[PDB]
Amino acid sequence: GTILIDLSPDDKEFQSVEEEMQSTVREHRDGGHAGGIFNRYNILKIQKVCNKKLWERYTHRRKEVSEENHNHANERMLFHGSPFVNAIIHKGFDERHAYIGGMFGAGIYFAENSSKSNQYVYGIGGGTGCPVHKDRSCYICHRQLLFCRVTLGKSFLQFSAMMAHSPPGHHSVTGRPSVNGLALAEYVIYRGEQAYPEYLITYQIMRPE
Numbered sequence: 275g276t277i278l279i280d281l282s283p284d285d286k287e288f289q290s291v292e293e294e295m296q297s298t299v300r301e302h303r304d305g306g307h308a309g310g311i312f313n314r315y316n317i318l319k320i321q322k323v324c325n326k327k328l329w330e331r332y333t334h335r336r337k338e339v340s341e342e343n344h345n346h347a348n349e350r351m352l353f354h355g356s357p358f359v360n361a362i363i364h365k366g367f368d369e370r371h372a373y374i375g376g377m378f379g380a381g382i383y384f385a386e387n388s389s390k391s392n393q394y395v396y397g398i399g400g401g402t403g404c405p406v407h408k409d410r411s412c413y414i415c416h417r418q419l420l421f422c423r424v425t426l427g428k429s430f431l432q433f434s435a436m437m438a439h440s441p442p443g444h445h446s447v448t449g450r451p452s453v454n455g456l457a458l459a460e461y462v463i464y465r466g467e468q469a470y471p472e473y474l475i476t477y478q479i480m481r482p483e
C-alpha cells in the first residue's frame with residue numbers, strides 16, 4: 275500500500291520539516307547516554323509517506339475525535355523514533371508500538387523534541403546503540419525518525435516531575451515536564467488510528483566542534 279516520495283532539499287516542504295527537526299534539539303539530562311552527544315543533525319533524506327488505506331484510517335478516527343471535542347481534532351505534528359519505523363510506514367501504528375512501561379500509561383509516545391525521539395531510535399533507553407558499532411552515540415550510521423500527524427482531541431494534562439485506555443472522557447495524554455523548563459511535551463495516544471506517519475527522515479547526529 276505504501277509509497278515513499280523523496281522530497282528535494284530545494285523544496286520548501288523539505289526545508290520546514292528540516293527546520294522542525296533542527297530547532298527542537300535540546301540537551302538531555304542523561305548527558306547523551308540514550309541518544310548520543312550532539313546539538314544538530316545531518317539530514318540525508320526526507321520522504322513523504324503515502325498510503326491511502328492508512329490515511330483514511332487516520333482521517334476516519336480524526337472526524338470521530340473531532341465530534342467528541344467541540345469540533346476540534348487538536349491535531350499536531352510530532353516526532354516518533356522506534357526500531358520498528360519500517361513496519362510503521364507499511365502497516366501503521368498499533369499496540370505493538372505501545373510503550374508498556376511508559377510514565378503516562380501503556381500507549382504510543384510522541385515527542386515535541388526531535389532529540390527526545392532520537393533517544394528511542396535504537397530501542398527503549400537507546401537499546402545497545404547502532405547495529406553495526408553498538409554505539410548509542412554513533413556519528414556514522416544513518417538513523418530514521420518519523421514526523422507524524424497526531425490527533426490529540428481532549429488531552430489529559432499530566433505534569434511530570436521531569437494498550438491502556440485514555441483517562442475517562444479523554445483522547446490522549448499530555449506529559450508536560452515541570453522541572454526542566456526547556457523540555458517540551460510528550461503525548462501518548464491509545465489507538466494507532468490516531469497517528470499517521472507522514473514523513474520519514476533519514477539523518478545522522480553530528481559530532482560537536
Ligand SMILES: Cc1cc(=O)[nH]c2cc(-c3ccc(C(=O)NCCN4CCOCC4)cc3Cl)ccc12
Pocket residue numbers: 353354355356357370371372373374383384385390391392394395396397398460
Ligand atoms: C517517549 C518516546 C518517544 C519516541 O519517539 N519513541 C518512543 C518509542 C518507544 C518504544 C516503545 C516500545 C518499544 C518496544 O521495544 N516494545 C517491545 C517490548 N518487548 C515486549 C516483549 O518482548 C519483545 C520486547 C520500543 C520503543 Cl523505542 C517508547 C517511548 C518513546
Ligand SMILES: [Zn+2]
Pocket residue numbers: 404405406407408409412413414415
Ligand atoms: Zn554505527
